[PDB]
Amino acid sequence: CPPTNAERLHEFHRAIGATPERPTPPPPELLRLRQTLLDEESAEVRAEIDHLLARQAAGEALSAGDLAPLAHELADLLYVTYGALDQLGIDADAVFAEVHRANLSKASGPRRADGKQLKPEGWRPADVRGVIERLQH
């Protein structure tokens, strides 16, 4: 069992001499900081997606290597998203596992015109409250 990306963030925060082991209500300034970071990386991802679409619209063919800047920015977005969960003292893997379980159960649902998977009749959402509760004991 190698380290997860969530565990990596925990390692990173310690390394920079900075997070709780259990779910911990944050100060307002912490929430505002995490929002700022999400917005910054999100904007950089958007810029790269826009640029790839623009090159395609121009009639250019994309190589695999052309995807590097987008992949970098998506990983940066992962980094700050995991970063937020870690600062809240929330095990991202525990939450993600439950979100995943409920996502799997969408398979019989219809699809949106753009390709988004939608929810079938009778679908039940992930119980993330339940995850937070057992993480805090």
Q: Contact with ligand UMP (CB under 6 A): which of 38, 99, 128, 135? A: 99
Residue with smaller CB distance to a second copy, 71 or 123? 71
Structure tokens at 45: 């991802």
How far apart CA 25 and CA 38 sit, in angstroms, is 19
Please state the φ and ψ torsions of residue 113, each to the nearest 5 degrees.
Answer: -55, -35
| Residue 130 Cβ vs Cl ion, minimum distance, rounded to whole Å | 26
Among 30, 37, 74, 128, binds Cl ion (CB under 5 A): 30
User: How far apart, in whole angstroms, are the C-alpha atoms of residue 66 and residue 72?
Assistant: 11
Q: State which of positions 36-55 bind ligand UMP (CB under 6 A).
A: 37, 40
Using CB under 5 A, which residues numbered 20 to 79 contact Mg ion? 44, 73, 76
Which of 19, 44, 76, 119 contacts a second copy by CB under 8 A?
76
> CB within 8 A of 77, min separation 6: which ones?
38, 41, 42, 44, 45
Binding residues for Mn(2+), by number, are 40-41, 44, 72-73, 76
